[PDB]
């Protein structure tokens, strides 16, 4: 598993849903999506960073070719950061 990612090792669907219920377990309000940054909003090569915020502060921000994909991929980023299984994590102690 060294080299791979959490969500190509644990195949999920509706990651925004998983984020919503897991934050209900954490007793924090359901997060808001905001459109943090963008480019090319009216062509077929857009960029959208959609950020996931909760009570004036963010837990994630993520890219996408459209707003829905960006939001759901930022939900994946939030789930990685909440489970601590990010890209930066302390590599395994062989």
């Amino acid at each position: 598993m060294t080299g791979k990612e959490l969500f190509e090792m644990w195949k999920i669907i509706n990651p925004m849903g998983l984020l919503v219920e897991e934050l209900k377990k954490r007793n924090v309000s359901a997060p808001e999506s905001r459109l943090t940054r963008q480019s090319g909003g009216t062509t077929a090569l857009p960029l959208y960073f959609v950020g996931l915020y909760c009570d004036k502060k963010l837990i994630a921000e993520g890219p996408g070719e459209t707003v829905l994909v960006a939001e759901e991929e930022a939900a994946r980023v939030a789930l990685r950061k909440l489970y601590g299984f990010t890209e930066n994590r302390r590599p395994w102690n062989y």
Binding site: T2, T86, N88, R89, R90, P91, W92, Y94
Partner: protein, 156 residues
């Protein structure tokens, strides 16, 4: 020495004031203690390290390969403590050196995995109207190391 405001009254770039060394040593000691406390608490992610092996400088993360064009004269699978690490880094700090870092401070280690020979590399000279044509098949020796652990010590 006063000059009124014109175009060439002053250079275009903003004069930045250098604060006095009193408060600058205050700032330096403060930042250093913060970073050293982060290390003692183990608050970093993974580390990268710029490392000066064979003759070239490699940006080396943990757990990854590096190919070196010489034979190191080490039997395979052998552990090595690469000294000459000359920059280290995490997400929230980096600790670069002048020029090297401390051998008591950063620990970079690597196993010799394989010692192969490279691909057959052609050397060919030709001069026109002069019957000059010379071929040669050079094929260098190479090793491949695996960077295992870049662990860092809080001795700042």
């Amino acid at each position: 020495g006063y000059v009124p405001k014109t175009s060439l009254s002053s250079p275009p770039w903003p004069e930045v004031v250098l604060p006095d060394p009193v408060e600058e040593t205050r700032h330096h000691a403060e930042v250093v203690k913060k970073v050293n406390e982060m290390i003692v608490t183990g608050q970093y992610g993974r580390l990268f390290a710029v490392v000066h092996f064979a003759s070239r400088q490699w940006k080396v993360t943990s757990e990854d390969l590096i190919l070196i064009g010489n034979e190191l004269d080490l039997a395979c699978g052998e552990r090595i403590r690469l000294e000459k690490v000359l920059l280290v880094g995490a997400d929230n700090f980096t600790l670069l050196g002048k020029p090297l870092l401390g051998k008591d401070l950063v620990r970079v280690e690597a196993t010799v995995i394989e010692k192969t020979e490279s691909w057959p590399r052609i050397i060919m000279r030709f001069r026109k109207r002069k019957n000059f044509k010379k071929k040669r098949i050079v094929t260098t020796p190479q090793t491949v190391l695996r960077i295992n652990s870049i662990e860092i010590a809080p001795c700042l």
